[PDB]
Design a binder for this molecule. Structure first.
Ligand SMILES: Nc1ncnc2c1ncn2[C@@H]1O[C@H](COP(=O)(O)OP(=O)(O)O)[C@@H](O)[C@H]1O
Lengths: 514, 513, 499
C-alpha cells in the first residue's frame, strides 16, 4: 500500500544519514583523527575517508550503494572521495522534507536532473581553458598544480621525480590517456634514492647463477611454462630399504631419469630456462643444476604473474604450454644483459631493450630504511594521477567554497525565474549546496553563518571575489595562493551524486527476500 | 483412560457421522462445484467423485473408517451414486437420535427400518416400466448417452464414442448367452490427437516404445509367427553386465551375435517366417545392430504380454528349436505397423482372431483432467449399459421416487400397534433430503419447490414430476429423456439399510477411552 | 468461512501492481543463503519466476501466468491484476448472499458481450506498403515504451523492423536467431548477410581454407562403434595401458586418414574432441571445430536442407551443403567465423554491443511479438487503439447490455464492468496525475459519442489516439481477457476446505 513503502523509504533515508554522519569531521587539511579499533584489540589512527569507508562493514542496501558510489568515484576521478557522501546526505535530507509535504518522486527527479544540467553548464561556462600543445605551458601547469598537495619539503623532494615522470611524452595530446595501461614502477631496497632514471626494456632483481662467465645474448628470456616438478611417490617407502638394490634404483631414478628430459629439451637452440615462484616445490634436485652448469647455465626464479604479463606485453609475445610442441615461437630480443650493482647492496639487472615494438618505460626508484620509498611512490602516484586528470580535459578552477555559493545563487535565481510546481523542488537544491564552505569555516575556527553570509554578499556584489583561507585564517583572494583543481573532479562528482540520489529515490515498494 | 458409559458414546458417534456426511451433502448433483485435494507435496488437483475423495480422506474414528470401507467396498454394482447414500445414512441417524431422546430402544427402530426398506422396495418394484424392445434401447441411445455424460468435459455432444462403446458391448452380450465379463473390456489412455478420434480395437493393440524415430524402418510383412525357442541371446531375468574377465571376448561375442543374426535371417528366409516374437530379449545395442542392416525386427518382449501373443494368432508353440516346419506356425491376415503421429513409435494391431476376448477402446486427449473425465464417462456408460442388458427395467429420476415411496409407506403404515409408525415415518420423512439438496444446490428455494411438486403429485396421477437443474421449461420427466436404473437404486437402498443397521447395532462401550 | 484462499490470491496480485505503465516503480530482490545478492528489476515476470509460495490458488495463478507468458508476449501483470480485481469483487458479491451460479452466468454474459464488442470494433485500412510500415513502427514504439529509457531506442527499433521485414511473409521461427555479446558502445550496430559462431579454438590452426564445403561427419571416437580396434583392460599387470593407448592412437589416426581421403577442408562437428586428435588435425592442416552449441548446427542444417549423419549410418544418403566465402574478420572484441557468400538471406544474426545487460530477453520478446503480428496480419490487418480506449468501450458495452435482462445476474455484470474500468486508473496513478478526473472525463467522452478518445502521458490531458499515432495488437487483448475469465471461473468455483 502506502504505509509500507513510506516506512521503507524513511528507514533507508535514516540509514543513509547515519552512514553520512558517521564520518564528517575530516574534510580539509585541518581535519580530526580517528582511532579505529580492530576485533582483536588493536587500534589504528587514521584520517582518510576512503580507508574508513573500506575498513568498516555493515549490511544494508543504502550503505552498499554508497560504498559502491565512493569506489566508483575513487576509480574514475581519484580525488575528493568524501564530499560526494555529504552531497548525497544533503540531497536526501532535502528530499525528506520534499516528500513530507506530498510531491511525486518523478517531478523531484526531473527537477534534480534539470538542476544538475544547469549546474554543469554553469561550471563549464565559468571555467577558463588553457593550452598544452607545447612543453612550457604543460610544465608550468604541472608545477602550479603540484605545489599544493603536501608540505613544502616533501614537495621539494618529489619535484625531481615529478619532472622526471612528466617528461614521458608519448600521446600527442589525445582525448584519453594510457598512464594506467603500460606502467610498472618497481621498488628496490638499498642504495641512495638520488640514483633514479627512466629505464626501458625490463628490470629484474634475481641472481642468475654463480659460475664462470654469463655474458651472452640469447633472447634473454626463456619462454617455457611446462611443469618442472619431480614425480612424487605414492607413499613414503614402497618396500624395505637396508642394503643395496633399493639404493641403486632410487639413485638411477634421481640421476638417470630427469637428465634424459634435460637432454631432450636442451637439443633445441637458445638454452635458456627458468621457473615461477617456489610456492609449491619442496626441494629442487641440485644434481640437475650441477649437470646444467656446463654448456652455458642461465636460470631466473622468483617470478610472479604480473611480471609475466608485463614481459609478454612489452616485448610482444605469447606464452606457450604443453610438452608436445615442435614449433619455434618462443624466441625474444637479443641486445645486452649481465649487469652489476650500482655501488651498494642488492642485486638488480636492467635491459634497455633496443629495437622493440613496445616503448614501455618505467621508473626504478630506491630508498633507505623503508621510510622514503613508499612516500615517494605515493607522491609520484598522485603526480601522474593529477597529470592524467589535467590532460583529460583543459578546464580548471579554484576551490574554497566560492563555486558552491555561486552555483547556489544561480540555482536560486533560476528557480525564481523558472515557472512551475517543480521550481520548489529546485529550491531544495538551492538549500543543498552551502555545506562545504560551512564545514570548512567550522573546522577552521570561525563563525560559519557569518562567513557564509559574507561570502554570499560578496558574490552578489562583486561576482568573483575571494573564498576561505586556511593558512592565514581569514578571507583572502585565491589568485595569490598557488592552488587549483580540475573541473572534472566536480562535474563527475555531481553527476555521480545525482545518479545515486535518483537510483535511491526510484527504488521503493517492498523489499522481499528468500 | 475413562470408559464412555451411558448415552454419550451414541451421541458422539452420531455427531461424527453427521460431520462426515456434511462434506458429501454439499457436493450433490451435476451443478455441484469442484472439490480440491492436495497431498504433502505441491500437487493440487480438483475433481468431483464420491470414491476418489473418500479414498484419500484422513479420519480419526473407527466409525468413519468402517463407513468409508463399506462405501468403497460397494461401488462396482452401482457406478455413479456413492454420494447420496451417505446423506441418507446421516439423515436416518439424525432421525434415530431425535426419536431416541424420548426413551426408545434402538432395537425397535433397527427392526422397523428393515420392513420399511422392504415395503419401499415392494412399492418401487410396482412403479416402473417394462415395454422395452429392440427399438427402445437403440433409438434413444443418443439421449441416454447425453443424460449419462452431460456437458462437463466437452460442451458439444459426442456420438462416435457412445456408439463405439455400445457396439463393444453388443458384440459380446448376445454372443455369450446374454452375459458379459469385466475382464474382456479394457480401457486405454494416451495423449496425442483430439477427443473425437475414438477407435474400437476389434483385436489387440500393442505398443513398443521405440528409442530413435530417425532410424530407418520400412514395413514389409504379411505373416506373424510365435516361437518359444531363444531366437537371440536371451536374458534369464538377470541384469547382465560386463561380467567377463577378458579383453578379446567382446569382439568374439559381437561376431557370434552377427553370425546368429545371419543364421536366423537365413532360416526365416528358407522356411517362410517373418516377424517372429519370442519371450526373451537383449539390450538396445543388439536391436540397433539388427536394425542397421536389413530385415527390421525389434526385441524386448519380456513379461506376461507374450500371453496375448499366444492368443492373437491361433495355434500352439514349439518345445524345441529343432522342430520347426511350414505347418507348425500360424497364418496371419493383416499384421503391419500403425503410427498416426509419424514422428513417435509404432503400434501393432492384430486384425485376425477367431473370438473377441480383448476388445478395447482408444481415446486421444491433450491434458490430464480431460482424459480422466472422458474415461470416467466411458466407465459410467459401460456400467449403465451392463445394468441395462442385465435387466430390461428402468425408472424415472429427479426426485419423485422418494416422495412416492414415502407416500406409499405412510398410506400402508398409518395403522400401527405400538411401534409400526415411529420408525417407518422417521425413515419416510428422511427420504426428501436428496431432492431438497438438489434444489438448494441451484438458485431456487428447495422448500417451496418440494411442496409444489408434492402437491402436484398428490393432486393428479402420473408420478413423473420433479425438479430441473438445467433451468428449462416445464418440470416433466418423460420429456427430458432422463432415466435411471432400478437395480442400482435397490442396491443403494440395501447398502444404506445395512449400514444404518450396523451403526445402530454396534454402540456399547469402547476399549480405548 | 472462505477467505484464506481469496486473500492469498489477492495479495499476490498487489505485489506487481506498481509495475504498470511506462513510469513504473523499481524494487530490489535480496537473496539469502551464503552470499546476499542485490539487483534492480522492472518487470513482474522475473519477480514471479524468482519467488516461492505455498497456497494452492496462488500456485495455480502463478502457473497460469507462466503459461500465458510462454504463449504470447508480456501478458503476466495485466491478467494478474484483472484476476485479483475480479476475485475482490466476487468476494463482496458472495458476502451479500448471492449464489455463485448467477455470478458465473453474469460473468459469462459480460465476457461474451466484451468479445462481441471487440470483434465488431476492428479497423481494416491497410492497402499500401507505407501503411503497414507505419503500423509496424507504431507497434514497435508502443512495445518499446515500457521501461522509459530514452538513450538508444530509434536505431534499435529501425534495426528490429529491418530484421523482421526481410522474412517477406515467410512462416518460420528457426531462421532468425540472436546471440548474447557485450562490449563496446550502445551506438554501434553491425549489419551482415549471415551468422556467426560463439567459440573459437584459437589462432594456432591454419585459417587459409579454400573451396567451402560443409561436411557433417558424426564419427565418434569413444561411442563404441562397429569393429573396435582396441580392447578393455585385464587384471594381471600394469602394462596393458600402453597397449590401449597405442590402439586408441592408431584408431584415431586411421579415422583421420579416412576423413582426409574422403575429401574435406573445414571440419565441423558437435561432439567432444580430446586434445590429441585436435592437435593431430591441427598438425595435418585441417581446422577442427569443437564444443558446439545445441542450436547452431541445427539452424545451419535446417536452412540448407541438411541433417546430421545419424551417428555414422548412411554417409552417401545425407545431403550436404556448401558455401563460397568463409573467413575470420576481427570485429568488435572477439574473432568469430563468418558465414557469407550465400544466396539465402532468411537466417541472419545481428551482433550487438554496449555495456549493459538484460537486453536479449526484451529483444527476443519484441521479435516474437513482431513476427506474430506479421504472420497474423498477412492479408487482413487488424489493429486497435491503446492508451485505455478498448477497455472503456468494453465497459460501456457491458453496462449497456446489463439493462434489459430482468432477474438477478445484473449485479455480476455491473461488478465486471466496474472491475474493467480500473486499468486506466492505475496507469494514471502510477504517473502522478489526478486519475479520478481523467477517468470521469474519459467516461463522459465515451458516453457522449466518441470512440476515439484517450489519455496522454506526456502532459496528462485528454486527446485523440488516431492523430498522435499509437496502436497495439488484436489477439493479445482477447487472449488476456479469455485467460482472466478462465482463471476467475476456476478460482471462484472453489470454496471448500483445503484437504
Ligand atoms: N591549500 C588549501 N586552501 C584552501 N582549501 C583547501 C586547500 N587544500 C585543500 N583544501 C580544501 O580541502 C578539501 C578537501 O579536503 P580532504 O577531504 O582532506 O582532501 P580530499 O578531498 O582530497 O580527500 C577541498 O574541498 C578543498 O576546498
Amino acid at each position: 500500500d502506502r504505509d509500507k513503502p513510506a516506512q521503507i523509504r524513511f528507514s533507508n533515508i535514516s540509514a543513509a544519514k547515519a552512514v553520512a554522519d558517521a564520518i564528517r569531521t575530516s574534510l580539509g587539511p585541518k581535519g580530526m583523527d580517528k582511532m579505529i579499533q580492530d576485533g582483536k584489540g588493536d587500534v589504528t589512527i587514521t584520517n582518510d575517508g576512503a580507508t574508513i569507508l573500506k575498513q568498516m562493514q555493515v549490511l544494508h542496501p543504502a550503505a552498499r550503494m554508497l560504498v559502491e558510489l565512493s569506489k566508483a568515484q575513487d576509480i574514475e576521478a581519484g580525488d575528493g572521495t568524501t564530499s560526494v557522501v555529504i552531497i548525497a546526505g544533503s540531497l536526501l535530507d532535502s528530499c525528506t522534507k520534499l516528500l513530507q509535504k506530498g510531491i511525486h518522486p518523478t517531478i523531484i527527479s526531473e527537477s534534480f536532473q534539470k538542476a544538475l544540467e544547469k549546474g554543469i553548464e554553469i561550471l563549464t561556462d565559468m571555467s577558463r581553458p588553457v593550452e598544452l600543445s607545447d612543453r612550457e605551458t604543460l610544465l608550468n601547469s604541472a608545477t602550479t598544480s603540484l605545489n599544493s598537495k603536501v608540505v613544502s619539503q616533501y614537495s621539494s623532494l618529489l619535484s625531481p621525480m615529478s619532472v622526471n615522470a612528466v617528461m614521458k611524452v608519448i600521446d600527442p595530446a589525445t582525448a584519453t590517456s594510457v598512464d594506467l595501461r603500460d606502467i610498472k614502477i618497481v621498488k628496490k631496497l638499498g642504495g641512495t634514492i638520488d640514483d633514479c632514471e627512466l629505464v626501458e626494456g625490463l628490470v629484474l632483481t634475481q641472481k642468475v647463477s654463480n659460475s664462470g662467465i654469463t655474458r651472452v645474448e640469447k633472447a634473454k628470456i626463456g619462454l617455457i611454462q611446462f611443469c618442472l616438478s619431480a614425480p612424487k611417490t605414492d607413499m613414503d617407502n614402497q618396500i624395505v630399504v637396508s642394503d643395496y638394490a633399493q639404493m641403486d634404483r632410487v639413485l638411477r631414478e634421481e640421476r638417470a631419469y630427469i637428465l634424459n628430459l634435460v637432454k631432450q629439451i636442451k637439443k633445441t637452440g637458445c638454452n635458456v630456462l627458468l621457473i615461477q615462484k617456489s610456492i609449491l616445490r619442496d626441494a629442487l634436485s641440485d644434481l640437475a643444476l650441477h649437470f646444467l652448469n656446463k654448456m652455458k647455465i642461465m636460470v631466473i626464479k622468483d617470478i610472479e604473474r604480473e611480471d609475466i604479463e608485463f614481459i609478454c606485453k612489452t616485448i610482444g609475445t605469447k606464452p606457450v604450454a604443453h610438452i608436445d610442441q615442435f614449433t619455434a615461437d618462443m624466441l625474444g630480443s637479443a641486445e645486452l644483459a649481465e649487469e652489476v650493482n650500482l655501488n651498494g647492496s642488492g642485486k638488480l639487472l636492467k635491459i634497455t631493450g633496443c629495437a622493440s615494438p613496445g616503448k614501455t618505460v618505467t621508473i626504478v626508484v630506491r630508498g633507505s630504511n623503508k621510510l622514503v620509498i613508499e612516500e615517494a611512490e605515493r607522491s609520484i602516484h598522485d603526480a601522474l594521477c593529477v597529470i592524467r586528470c589535467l590532460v583529460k580535459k583543459r578546464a580548471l578552477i579554484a576551490g574554497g567554497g566560492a563555486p558552491e555559493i555561486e552555483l547556489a545563487l544561480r540555482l536560486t535565481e533560476y528557480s525564481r525565474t523558472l515557472s512551475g510546481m517543480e521550481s520548489y523542488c529546485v529550491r531544495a537544491f538551492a538549500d543543498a549546496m552551502e555545506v562545504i564552505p560551512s564545514t570548512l569555516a567550522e573546522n577552521a575556527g570561525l563563525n560559519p553563518i557569518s562567513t557564509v553570509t559574507e561570502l554570499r554578499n560578496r558574490h552578489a556584489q562583486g561576482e568573483k571575489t575571494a573564498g576561505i583561507n586556511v593558512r592565514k585564517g581569514g578571507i583572502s583572494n585565491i589568485l595569490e595562493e598557488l592552488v587549483v583543481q580540475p573541473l572534472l573532479v566536480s562535474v563527475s562528482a555531481l553527476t555521480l551524486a545525482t545518479e545515486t540520489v535518483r537510483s535511491i529515490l526510484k527504488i521503493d515498494d517492498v523489499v522481499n527476500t528468500r | 483412560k475413562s470408559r464412555l458409559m451411558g448415552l454419550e458414546a451414541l451421541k458422539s458417534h452420531i455427531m461424527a457421522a453427521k460431520a462426515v456426511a456434511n462434506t458429501m451433502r454439499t457436493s450433490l448433483g451435476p451443478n455441484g462445484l469442484d472439490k480440491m485435494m492436495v497431498d504433502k507435496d505441491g500437487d493440487v488437483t480438483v475433481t468431483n467423485d464420491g470414491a476418489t475423495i473418500l479414498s484419500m480422506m484422513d479420519v480419526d474414528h473407527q466409525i468413519a473408517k468402517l463407513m468409508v470401507e463399506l462405501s468403497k467396498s460397494q461401488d462396482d454394482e452401482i457406478g455413479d451414486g456413492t454420494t447420496g447414500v451417505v446423506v441418507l445414512a446421516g439423515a436416518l441417524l439424525e432421525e434415530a437420535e431425535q426419536l431416541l431422546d424420548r426413551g426408545i430402544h434402538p432395537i425397535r427402530i433397527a427392526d422397523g427400518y428393515e420392513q420399511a426398506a422392504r415395503v419401499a422396495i415392494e412399492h418401487l418394484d410396482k412403479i416402473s416400466d417394462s415395454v422395452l424392445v429392440d427399438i427402445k434401447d437403440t433409438e434413444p441411445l443418443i439421449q441416454t448417452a447425453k443424460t449419462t455424460l452431460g456437458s462437463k468435459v466437452v460442451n458439444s455432444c459426442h456420438r462416435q464414442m457412445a456408439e463405439i462403446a455400445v457396439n463393444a458391448v453388443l458384440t459380446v452380450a448376445d454372443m455369450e448367452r446374454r452375459d458379459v465379463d469385466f475382464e474382456l473390456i479394457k480401457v486405454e489412455g494416451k495423449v496425442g490427437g483430439r477427443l473425437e478420434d475414438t477407435k474400437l480395437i476389434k483385436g489387440v493393440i500393442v505398443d513398443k516404445d521405440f528409442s530413435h524415430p530417425q532410424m530407418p524402418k520400412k514395413v514389409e510383412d504379411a505373416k506373424i509367427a510365435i516361437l518359444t525357442c531363444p531366437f537371440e541371446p536371451p536374458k534369464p531375468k538377470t541384469k547382465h553386465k560386463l561380467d567377463v574377465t577378458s579383453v578379446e571376448d567382446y569382439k568374439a561375442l559381437q561376431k557370434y551375435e552377427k553370425e546368429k543374426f545371419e543364421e536366423m535371417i537365413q532360416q526365416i528366409k528358407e522356411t517362410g517366417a517373418n516377424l517372429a516374437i519370442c519371450q526373451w530379449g537383449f539390450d538396445d545395442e543388439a536391436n540397433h545392430l539388427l536394425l542397421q542392416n536389413n530385415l527390421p525386427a525389434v526385441r524386448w518382449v519380456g513379461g506376461p504380454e507374450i500371453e496375448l501373443i499366444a492368443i492373437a494368432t491361433g495355434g500352439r508353440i514349439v518345445p524345441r528349436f529343432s522342430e520347426l516346419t511350414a505347418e507348425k506356425l500360424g497364418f496371419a491376415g493383416l499384421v503391419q505397423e500403425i503410427s498416426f503421429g509419424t514422428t513417435k513409435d509404432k503400434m501393432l494391431v492384430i486384425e485376425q482372431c477367431k473370438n473377441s476376448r480383448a476388445v478395447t477402446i482408444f481415446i486421444r486427449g491433450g491434458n490430464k483432467m480431460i482424459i480422466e473425465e472422458a474415461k470416467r464417462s466411458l466407465h459410467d456408460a459401460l456400467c449403465v449399459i451392463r445394468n441395462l442388458i442385465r435387466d430390461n427395467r428402468v425408472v424415472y429420476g429427479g426426485g419423485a421416487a422418494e416422495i412416492s415411496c414415502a407416500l406409499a409407506v405412510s398410506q400402508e403404515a398409518d395403522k400401527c400397534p405400538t411401534l409400526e409408525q415411529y420408525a417407518m415415518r422417521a425413515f419416510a420423512d428422511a427420504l426428501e433430503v436428496i431432492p431438497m439438496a438438489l434444489s438448494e444446490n441451484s438458485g431456487m428455494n428447495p422448500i417451496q419447490t418440494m411442496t409444489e411438486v408434492r402437491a402436484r403429485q398428490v393432486k393428479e396421477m402420473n408420478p413423473a414430476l420433479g425438479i430441473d437443474c438445467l433451468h428449462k421449461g416445464t418440470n416433466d420427466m418423460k420429456q427430458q429423456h432422463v432415466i435411471e436404473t432400478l437395480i442400482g437404486k435397490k442396491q443403494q437402498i440395501s447398502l444404506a439399510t445395512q449400514m444404518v443397521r450396523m451403526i445402530l447395532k454396534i454402540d456399547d462401550i469402547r476399549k480405548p477411552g | 468461512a472462505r477467505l484464506t484462499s481469496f486473500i492469498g490470491a489477492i495479495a499476490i496480485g498487489d505485489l506487481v501492481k506498481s509495475t504498470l505503465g511506462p513510469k513504473g516503480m523499481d524494487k530490489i530482490l535480496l537473496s539469502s543463503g551464503r552470499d546476499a545478492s542485490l539487483m534492480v528489476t522492472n518487470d513482474g515476470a522475473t519477480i514471479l519466476k524468482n519467488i516461492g509460495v505455498d497456497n494452492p490458488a496462488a500456485k495455480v495463478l502463478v502457473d497460469m501466468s507462466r503459461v500465458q507468458d510462454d504463449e504470447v508476449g508480456d501478458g503476466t501483470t495485466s491478467v494478474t491484476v484483472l484476476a485479483a480485481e475480479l476475485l475482490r469483487e466476487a468476494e463482496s458479491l458472495i458476502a451479500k448472499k448471492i449464489h455463485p451460479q448467477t455470478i458465473i452466468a453474469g460473468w459469462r454474459e459480460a465476457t461474451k458481450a466484451a468479445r462481441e464488442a471487440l470483434l465488431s470494433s476492428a479497423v481494416d485500412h491497410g492497402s499500401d506498403e507505407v501503411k503497414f510500415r507505419q503500423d509496424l513502427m507504431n507497434i514497435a514504439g508502443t512495445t518499446l515504451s515500457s521501461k522509459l529509457l530514452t538513450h538508444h531506442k530509434d536505431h534499435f527499433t529501425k534495426l528490429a523492423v529491418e530484421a523482421v521485414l526481410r522474412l517477406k511473409g515467410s512462416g518460420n521461427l528457426e531462421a532468425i536467431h540472436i546471440i548474447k555479446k557485450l562490449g563496446g558502445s550502445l551506438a554501434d550496430s553491425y549489419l551482415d548477410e549471415g551468422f556467426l559462431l560463439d567459440k573459437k579454438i584459437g589462432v594456432n590452426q591454419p585459417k587459409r581454407i579454400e573451396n567451402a564445403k560443409i561436411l557433417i561427419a558424426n564419427t565418434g571416437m569413444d561411442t563404441d562403434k562397429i569393429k573396435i580396434f582396441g580392447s578393455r583392460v585385464r587384471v594381471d599387470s600394469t602394462a596393458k595401458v600402453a597397449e590401449i593407448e597405442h590402439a586408441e592412437k592408431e584408431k584415431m589416426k586411421e579415422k583421420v586418414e579416412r576423413i582426409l581421403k574422403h575429401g574435406i577442408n573445414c571440419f565441423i562437428n558437435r561432439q567432444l574432441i580430446y586434445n590429441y586428435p585436435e592437435q593431430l588435425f591441427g598438425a595435418a592442416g585441417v581446422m577442427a571445430i569443437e564444443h558446439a552449441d545445441f542450436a547452431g548446427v541445427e539452424r545451419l542444417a535446417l536452412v540448407t536442407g541438411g541433417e546430421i549423419a545419424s551417428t555414422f549410418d548412411h554417409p552417401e544418403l545425407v545431403k550436404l551443403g556448401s558455401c563460397k566465402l568463409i573467413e575470420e574478420v576481427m570485429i568488435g572484441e572477439d574473432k568469430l567465423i563468418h558465414f557469407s557468400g550465400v544466396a539465402l538471406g532468411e537466417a541472419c544474426t545481428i551482433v550487438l554491443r554496449g555495456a549493459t545487460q538484460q537486453i536479449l530477453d526484451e529483444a527476443e520478446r519484441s521479435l516474437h511479438d513482431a513476427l506474430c503480428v506479421l504472420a497474423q496480419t498477412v492479408k487482413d490487418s487488424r489493429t486497435v487503439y491503446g492508451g485505455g480506449c478498448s477497455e472503456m468501450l468494453m465497459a460501456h458495452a457491458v453496462t449497456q447490455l446489463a439493462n434489459r435482462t430482468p432477474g438477478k445476474e445484473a449485479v455480476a455484470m455491473e461488478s465486471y464492468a466496474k472491475a474493467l474500468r480500473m486499468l486506466p486508473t492505475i496507469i494514471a496513478d502510477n504517473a502522478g496525475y489526478d486519475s479520478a478526473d481523467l477517468v470521469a472525463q474519459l467516461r463522459a467522452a465515451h458516453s457522449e459519442g466518441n470512440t476515439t478518445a484517450g489519455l496522454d502521458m506526456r502532459e496528462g490531458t485528454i486527446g485523440d489516439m488516431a492523430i498522435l499515432g499509437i496502436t497495439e495488437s488484436f489477439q493479445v487483448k482477447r487472449q488476456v481477457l479469455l485467460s482472466a475469465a478462465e482463471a476467475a471461473e476456476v478460482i471462484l468455483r472453489v470454496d471448500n476446505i483445503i484437504k
